[PDB]
């Protein structure tokens, strides 16, 4: 029905919000510290000297284990 399409769109937008804001390909699993923006995968986060959301300097990157994480398994 039309509601199937609406639900597919909601699911797609939620899954998109879980992907890296830089590469759009890998899951978010890293936090820029100390600002706390958690918007990148580990590969993009390692390459950024400033947070891409707030431009605060990145002192270090904290890996985050989230309950929503998925994998080929």
Ligand X SMILES: COc1ccccc1-c1nnc(N)o1
Residue closest to ligand X (Cβ)? 68
17 lines the binding site for ligand X (CB under 6 A): yes
State the binding partner of 24 from ligand X, Zn ion, a copy of itself, none, CB within 5 to 8 A by kind.
none
- Tokens for 20? 């890296």
Region of residue 20 (phi > 0: left; psi between -120 and 50: alpha; otherwise: beta):
beta
Shortest Cβ 25–a copy of itself spacing (Å) = 15
Range 25-64, binding a copy of itself (CB under 8 A):
28, 31, 33-39, 53, 62-64
Tell me the C-alpha distance between 35 and 52, whole Å: 11
Sign of CA dihedral 7, 11, 12, 14: positive
Interacting residue ranges for ligand X, rule: CB under 6 A: 17-18, 27-28, 66-69
């Amino acid at each position: 029905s039309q509601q199937t399409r609406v639900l597919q769109e909601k699911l797609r937008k939620l899954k998109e919000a879980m992907l890296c804001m830089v590469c759009c390909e890998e899951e978010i699993n890293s936090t820029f510290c100390p600002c706390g923006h958690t918007v990148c995968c580990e590969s993009c986060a390692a390459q950024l000297q400033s947070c891409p959301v707030c431009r605060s300097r990145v002192e270090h990157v904290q890996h985050v284990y989230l309950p929503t994480h998925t994998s080929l398994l």
